[PDB]
Amino acid sequence: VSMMCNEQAYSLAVEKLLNIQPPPRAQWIRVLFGEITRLLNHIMAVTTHALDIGAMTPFFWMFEEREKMFEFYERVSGARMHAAYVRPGGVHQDLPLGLMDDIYEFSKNFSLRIDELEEMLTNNRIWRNRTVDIGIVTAEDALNYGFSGVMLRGSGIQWDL
Amino acid sequence: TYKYVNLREPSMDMKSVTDRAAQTLLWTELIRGLGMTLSYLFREPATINYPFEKGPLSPRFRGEHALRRYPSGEERCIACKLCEAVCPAQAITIEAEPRADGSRRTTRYDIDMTKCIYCGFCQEACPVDAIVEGPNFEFSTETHEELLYNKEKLLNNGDKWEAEIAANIQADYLYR
Amino acid sequence: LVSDGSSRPYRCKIKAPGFAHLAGLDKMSKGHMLADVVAIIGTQDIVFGEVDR
Amino acid sequence: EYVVAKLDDLINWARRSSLWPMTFGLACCAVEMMHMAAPRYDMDRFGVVFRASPRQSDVMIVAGTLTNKMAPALRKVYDQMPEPRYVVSMGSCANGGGYYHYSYSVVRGCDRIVPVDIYVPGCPPTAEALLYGILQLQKKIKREKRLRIWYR
Amino acid sequence: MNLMLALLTNFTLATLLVIIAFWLPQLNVYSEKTSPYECGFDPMGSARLPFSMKFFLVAITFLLFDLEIALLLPLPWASQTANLNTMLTMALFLIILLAVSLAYEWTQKGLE
Amino acid sequence: MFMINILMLIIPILLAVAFLTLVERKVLGYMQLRKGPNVVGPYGLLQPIADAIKLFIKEPLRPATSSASMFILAPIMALGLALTMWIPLPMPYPLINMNLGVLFMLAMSSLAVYSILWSGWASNSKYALIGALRAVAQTISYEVTLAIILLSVLLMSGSFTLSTLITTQEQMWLILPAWPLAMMWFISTLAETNRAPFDLTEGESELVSGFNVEYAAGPFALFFMAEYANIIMMNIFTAILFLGTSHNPHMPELYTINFTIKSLLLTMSFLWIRASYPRFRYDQLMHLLWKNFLPLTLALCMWHVSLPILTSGIPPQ
Amino acid sequence: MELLQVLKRGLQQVSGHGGLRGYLRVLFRANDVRVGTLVGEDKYGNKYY
Ligand SMILES: CCCCCCCCCCCCCCCCCC(=O)OC[C@H](COP(=O)(O)OCCN)OC(=O)CCCCCCCCCCCCCCCCC
Ligand SMILES: CCCCCCCCCCCCCCCCCC(=O)OC[C@H](COP(=O)(O)OCCN)OC(=O)CCCCCCCCCCCCCCCCC
Ligand code: SF4
Ligand code: SF4
Ligand code: SF4
């Protein structure tokens, strides 16, 4: 489900070997995508989790909204999910005339959609009863196991790369 | 920096316990919570009615293959052997021969439609601008013996439209 | 990513989660029910093919 | 006659009015099927309800990628399905295996295990060329069981 | 005399539709591979049914709470009566006699 | 023409369980922002007559490692008591005038769990062997949550017949003087008849619903069928008990019109709950019966004993 | 009083589009029943609205 988050850690691992930095516009594209796949990997982890538990709608309530955002891959790279876009020298090609009147219309109206899950799940009682004090691994055996982030910092140790 | 979430004690006085004991016992949550947030059914449903309506796409879309040709025909390919050297999946299979007129062309040209991983690496390696990922997802044949493509499928499949393709490339060659 | 010096690379070892996040389930699961176990796994956000690390 | 061959204008219509798909979501073509159950190109209520149990399903949909360690667990599940069963493979890895066609640990094609009806090509097919895939499967049902007992 | 022909209709319509599904349209003499399959979506279960203590006490506890609701059952018939100080103070006894049987067992239930 | 009345009640209700499966998903669809069955109907309305014939064509296998006389006897007792319970029920006139028939509901609602104990045993192993044993265990515990607060209104009704249950509510709509009992009346039938928040019978991610898990669409076609016959019958039983309508002898036509409109509304709630709430994780399911549901039910029981006495308001019988 | 406040628009929309025959002829393929605003020209008789 991470599309541009992978190839961000391959291109950056080959630029080091080449002694080449990417140019300045090629860095503010990678962040606008590398921080828009973090609104896709976190839609899935908070919905399919809550479908295994058994809540039906926030799966459907978010994927109906999610299809406004697989639109944005197609307009820039060419394709639906797996885009071969990032290269070891920056972005392949330029994004079309647009996408700044269409990300802006989108991203000014996403904080209401995330204001629905707060009322579905957080102050809900049954889901709080399904999830409190469950799977408490918190020790320095929760770092001896070599964990990366969350299931770290969500339990104690503040650190991220 | 920081932010602390779910780090707050209850008030634990005489007033706000009745505010919480009205919650557990007489359900001021769970009806105001989700007897109202759900219904909210009164929006218009967003369903693409598929055999008639179809969904939006973009002029750089990837799909069925094609081989263009010039104004009055020349079979734009020149068998220069690059679209086969950067297929990552080794789908293309070209075998040229000096054609009798003197200009070199293909004899056999084979694209599997199953090993085709749909890069866009054939589309951009070509110097003479021939092989183009054409914008039609119409597929779904019933035999594995069929999805192997020859040369003389692709031309037929590449001259069923060129009003479709040449409207796309003229819009998008200015970036690449 | 060990590179030898020519166009084709040498070994390319991937590190991904699922090695850490799922070796530490056997510690995490003991004591609780069976219907707690399906509640555990969703929070690690396990995506397979990435356990191909 | 006109009496018997009229009856397969109902049974071969009842068999194509509600398919119940099992799916094998294994790899990336799982997610691009889940958007079809998402209400944009809404899969259900165009005839075909979604995922069920292996005892009750008509038409299974293979996706993803079949390795060696899933090859017996497929064929076992294919056995339990009833007599009017159909197999659709989506994805370009259940057609001859995408890439990983040349690596050691892949069953090279998924037709080598089961007989599969409609092949749908594309790394992930866009849930748009999959409704066109199943609307090819309903057009396949023009067969009759009448004029078989009534001919021979 | 219809009570008793109010249900023997309902059961002979019930057993009708099951044999026109289990029998008739069925008879699977063709290939019908009944091999080692059909094992309820699994394999061979060489273990038998093991005892589970926390799922036995749920059976007995219900049975002893089920009896004295039948003592408690003729309370609406115990309304149109004679002497009613007796009728009230005895009706309150059984409920408390049911309530104490909670509180003793309530100090040890287990993961039920 | 008594025999023509019985068939006039079994047949028009098999449509109302077949035309509920269609409204099962249209109502559950507009909550997801999507249309109903769009293409086959025209509006959907012809879906279940096509979706019924497919089941009786598709091959009804029996499992090889199964028993014989038990596996094909539980669907006999499934539709038996699912349809026999519709008899003593006034609308406005019942088919049968039982002297005491409110108790006969529990005489019919008790034996339904004795088929689940069969079918979980009769076929096969662990996905319905132990996985159905803990489905009998939840359904037995919600009678003592049920039978008490069913008795807790009869101290105010007066007797056991159902004609008095419409007479006593000519001016009240009795949900008001007993609204704490009316809450736990709902959740009991929401969990006894094996529905969406307290599930493990049908099965979400539990016994992968191992109480059906094995029936191919021959015998399976009733289980679902029969089961959907309980859920519109506790709704027709709640609305004759709490939310009672008005009866006029000169006009019995206007009874049923104002009556079937009400049982349909409560039937919507079993659909409207499922699209909100997650499951209960079998411990917390039974952890709230004893500890939490039950001691209040005795508390109001002792309340409804004394209050007809210390009001001097004894109901007449 | 929205039972006639907005049905008045739908009365000309439902009924007066092709009479009695032209309405149910498009209803039997799907619930695509709304008459579109504009027309296409191409090609055969299939006016892509
Ligand atoms: C697999 C197929 C083979 C099996 C097929 C047979 C299956 C039958 C299963 C049906 C089980 C239903 C048994 C329910 C018994 C309760 C009947 C009852 O109590 O009726 C109420 C009524 C009480 O009398 P009352 O209300 O005072 O009448 C008014 C007078 N003014 O009472 C009356 O109105 C009349 C009482 C006498 C009526 C005849 C006796 C009723 C029972 C006859 C069937 C015997 C039970 C069979 C064994 C049951 C097995 C489950
Ligand atoms: C002095 C004069 C006399 C005084 C009279 C006073 C009258 C007072 C009446 C009070 C008694 C009636 C209320 C019934 C009690 C409520 C049931 C209950 O106790 O639930 C407790 C349950 C336990 O969980 P909790 O304690 O909150 O701990 C977890 C917190 N993390 O926590 C819960 O909240 C669980 C909630 C219910 C669980 C099921 C939810 C599933 C959805 C059900 C929706 C039902 C909606 C309404 C039903 C239909 C109504 C018509
Ligand atoms: S399209 Fe280009 S790369 Fe492909 S065969 Fe022709 S000349 Fe060679
Ligand atoms: S799309 Fe990519 S993999 Fe497929 S034929 Fe073209 S270059 Fe080869
Ligand atoms: S090759 Fe196609 S089917 Fe295989 S994982 Fe990738 S997208 Fe999915």
Burial classification of residue F1, based on how many CB atoms lie within 10 Å of its CB (0-12 exposed, 13-18 middle, 19 or more buried): exposed
Provide the resolution (angstroms).
3.8
Show residues of chain B in contact with G36, CB under 8 Å: none
Give the bridge partners for B131, in sequence order.
B67
Longest dimension (CA), chain C: 55
Whose CA is closest to A93, among B59, E102, E107?
Answer: B59
DSSP string, E50-101: ---GGGTHHHHHHHHHHHTTTSSTTSSTTSS-S--HHHHHHHHHHHHHHHHH
| Residue ranges per structural domain of chain E | 7-107
Q: Mutate one of A116, A126, A127 to test the F interface: name it (highest F CB count within 10 A).
A: A126
Closest CA to B149 of B93, B74, B96, B68: B93
Give the per-residue SS3 of chain A.
CCCCCCCHHHHHHHHHHHCCCCCCHHHHHHHHHHCCHHHCHHHHHHHCHHHHCCCCHHHHHHHHHHCCCCHHHHHHCCCCCCCCCEEECEECCCCCCCCCCCHHHHHCCCCCCHHHHHHHHHCCHHHHHHCCCCCCCCCCHHHHCCCCCCCCHHHCCCCCC
Strand partners for A91 = A86
Rounded Cα gap, residues B131 and G27, in angstroms: 44
Task: Give the Å distance between the CA of B95 and the centre of ligand 3.
Answer: 12
Residue B174 CA to chain centroid, in angstroms? Answer: 21
Instruction: Say whether D18 and F51 touch across the interface (CB within 8 A).
Output: yes
Q: Do G29 and F39 touch (CB under 8 A)?
A: yes
Question: From CA D109, how far away is CA D4, in angstroms rounded?
Answer: 40
Do the Cβ atoms of G30 and F38 come closer than 8 Å?
Answer: yes
Kindly report the protein residue whose alpha carbon is nearest to atom 2 of ligand 4: B119
What 3 state SS string does B28-61 have? CCCCCCCCCCCCCCCCCCCCCCCCCCCCCCCCCC
* Contact in structure between A150 and C44 (CB atoms under 8 Å): no
Q: Cβ atoms within 10 A of the Cβ of F36, count?
A: 22
Under an 8 A CB cutoff, do E41 and D54 touch?
yes
Domain count for chain D? 1
Which domain CATH number covers D3?
3.40.50.12280
Q: Which atom belonging to ligand 5 lies closest to the Cα atom of D90?
A: 3
Sign of the torsion angle spanned by Cα atoms F257, F259, F264, F265: positive
Enumerate the residues of chain B whose CB falls inside 8 A of the CB of residue A79: 61-62, 118, 120
Name every chain A residue with its beta carbon within 8 A of the beta carbon of C1.
Answer: 13-14, 17
Would you say the CB of residue B25 lies under 6 angstroms from ligand 2? yes
The CATH homologous superfamily for domain E7-107 is NADH:ubiquinone/plastoquinone oxidoreductase, chain 3 (1.20.58.1610)
**Would you state the structure tokens that stand for residue D23, as one six-digit string?**
């799916």
**Per the CB < 8 Å rule, is A64 touching D123?**
no
Instruction: Please name which of A151, A129, A1 lies closest in space to residue A53, comparing C-alpha atoms.
Output: A129
**Gyration radius of chain E's alpha carbons:** 26
CA–CA separation, E77 and E75 (whole Å): 5
Residue F170: CB partners within 8 Å, gap ≥ 6?
F246
Nearest chain B CA: its distance from D29 CA (Å): 13
Sheet holding B93-98, edge to edge: B93-98, B104-112, B148-149
Q: Is D70 on the interface with C (CB under 8 A)?
A: no
* Sequence-ordered list of residues with C-beta below 8 angstroms from that of F222, at least 6 positions apart, any chain: E17, E18, F75, F78, F79
* Terminal C-alpha separation, chain A: 21
Q: Give the ligand 5 atom nearest the CA of D28.
A: 8
**Torsions phi, psi for E77 (to 5 deg):** -75, -20
Interatomic CA distance for residues F146 and F241, integer angstroms: 14
Do F37 and F44 touch, CB atoms closer than 8 A?
A: yes
Nearest ligand, measured from the Cα of F75:
1
Name the token pair of F299.
Answer: 């508390």
Q: Is F288 in the pocket of ligand 2 (CB under 6 A)?
A: yes
Q: Check CB contact under 8 Å for F280 and A53.
A: no
Give the phi and the psi of residue B149 in degrees, each rounded to 5. -100, 145
Q: Which residues pair with D67 in a beta bridge?
A: D106
Interatomic CA distance for residues D86 and D22, integer angstroms: 11
Peptide bond between residue F277 and the one before it cis (omega within 30 degrees of 0):
no
Closest among B41, E78, E85 to F317, alpha carbons compared? E78
Residues from A in contact with F at Cβ < 8 Å? 50, 52-57, 60-61, 64, 126-127, 129-130
List C-alpha distances in Å: E105 to E97, E108, F290, F300, F302.
13, 5, 11, 22, 21
Tell whether C16 is within 8 A of chain A (Cβ): no
Cβ of D18 and F29 within 8 Å? no
| Residues ending a continuous segment of chain D before a break (C–N > 2.5 Å) | none
Amino acid symbol at F151: L
Size of interface A-D (CB pairs under 8 A): 26
Alpha carbon E83 to its chain centroid, in Å, reads 38
Q: In what order do the strands lie in the sheet with D59-62?
A: D23-24, D59-62, D86-89, D118-119
CA distances from E79 to B122, E87, F311 (A): 92, 8, 13
CB–CB contact C33 F281 (8 Å): yes
Boundaries of domain holding D23: 1-152
Mutate to test the pocket of ligand 1, among E2, E3, E9 (most ligand atoms within 8 A of CB): E3
CA distance D112 to F257: 62
β strands within chain D, DSSP E: 23-24, 59-62, 86-89, 118-119
Tell me the torsion sign for CA atoms D8, D14, D17, D18.
Answer: negative
CA-nearest of F191, A67, E56 to D127 is A67
F154: enclosing H helix or E strand:
helix F147-157
Between the CA of E18 and the centroid of ligand 5 the distance, in Å, is 45
Helix H, strand E, coil C: the string for chain B is CCCCCCCCCCCCCCHHHHHHHHHHHHCCCCCCCCCCCCCCCCCCCCCCCCCCCCCCCCCCCCCECCECCCCCCCCCCCCCCCCCCCCCCCCCEEEEEECCCCCEEEEEEEEECCCCCCCCCHHHHCCCCCECCECCCCCCCCCCCCCEECHHHHHHHHHCCCCCHHHHHHHHCCCC
User: Which of F34, F50, F220 is closest, CB to CB, to D17?
Assistant: F50
**Nearest Cα residue in chain D from C48:** D27
User: How far away, in angstroms, is D92 Cα from ligand 5 center?
Assistant: 6
Give burial (CB, 10 Å; 0-12/13-18/19+) of B8: exposed
Residues in chain B, total: 176
CA distance E77 to A101: 77
DSSP state of D130: T
Residue F269: name the closest of A159, A28, B35 by CA.
B35
Residue of C3, C20, C42 lying closest to A145 (CB–CB): C20
Residue type, F211: F
User: Could you tell me the CA-to-CA distances from F242 to E87, F169, F269 in Å, in that order?
Assistant: 27, 8, 16
Report the alpha-carbon angle D30-D34-D39, nearest 5.
Answer: 165
List the chains bordering chain B where 3 or more Cβ pairs fall under 8 Å: A, D, F, G
CB C25 within 8 A of CB A137: no
B residues 64-123 closer than 8 Å to D (CB): 88-90, 112-118
Output the six-digit token pair for B109.
């040209």
Q: How far is CA F132 from the centre of its chain?
A: 19
> Within 10 A of A8 (CB to CB), how many other CB atoms are there?
17
**Is-contact C49 C33, C-beta < 8 A?**
no
Distance (Å, rounded) from C-alpha F194 to C-alpha F116?
A: 11
CB atoms within 10 A of CB G8: 9
In angstroms, the first-to-last Cα distance of chain C is 13
Q: What is the CATH number of the domain that holds B114?
A: 3.30.70.3270
Cβ neighbours for B77, distance < 8 A, ≥ 6 positions apart:
B67, B105, B106, B109, B128, B130, B131
Residue B100 CB partners (closer than 8 Å, separation 6+): none
The CA F194 to ligand 2 mean position distance, Å, reads 20
Query: Does D123 belong to an annotated binding site?
Result: yes
Q: How far apart are CA F180 and CA F174, in angstroms?
A: 12
Alpha carbons F165 and F175: distance in angstroms, whole number: 13
* Residue B79 beta carbon below 6 angstroms from any ligand 3 atom: yes
Ligand 1 site: residues with CB under 6 angstroms?
E 3-4, 7, 11, 15; F 76, 98-100
How crowded is residue F277: how many other Cβ atoms within 10 Å of its Cβ? 21
Which chain D residues touch A67 with a CB distance below 8 Å? 35, 38, 40
CA distance E30 to chain D (A): 11
Place of tokens 């009998």: F136
Tokens linked to F213: 């898990």
D129 touches chain A (CB under 8 A): no
Q: Pocket residues for ligand 4 (CB within 6 Å)?
A: B 87-89, 91-92, 111, 116-122
Query: F136: which 2 tokens?
Result: 């009998």
Residue among B121, B133, B147 to mutate when testing ligand 4 (max atoms within 8 A of CB): B121
B96 close to ligand 3 (CB < 6 Angstrom)? no
Contact yes or no for D63/D24 (Cβ under 8 A):
yes
Name the binding residues of B: 77, 80, 83, 87, 116, 119, 122, 126
Residue B80's domain comprises 64-175
CA distance G25 to B31: 44
Cβ neighbors of F257 (< 8 A, separation 6 or more) are none
CA distance F266 to B82: 69
**Residue A142's CB: how many other CB atoms inside 10 A?**
20
A32-56 burial by CB neighbour count: b if 16+ within 10 A, else e?
ebbebbeebeebbbbbebbbebbbb
Chain F touched by G14 (CB under 8 Å): no
In our burial notation (b when 16+ CB lie closer than 10 A, e otherwise), range B95-115 reads ebeeeeeeeebbeebbbbbbb
G32: left (phi over 0), alpha (psi -120 to 50) or beta: beta
Yes or no, beta carbons of C39 and A131 under 8 Å apart:
yes
Q: State the structure-solving technique.
A: cryo-EM
The two structure tokens encoding residue B122: 């054939």
CA–centroid distance, residue A125 to ligand 2 (Å): 11
ω into residue F126 within 30 of 0, thus cis? no
CB C20 within 8 A of CB C50: no
Question: Strand B93-98 relative to strand B104-112: parallel, antiparallel, unpaired?
Answer: antiparallel
Inter-chain residue contact C40 with A135, CB threshold 8 Å: yes
Contact, A144 vs A127, CB < 8 A? Answer: no
Closest CA of chain D from B44, distance in Å:
12
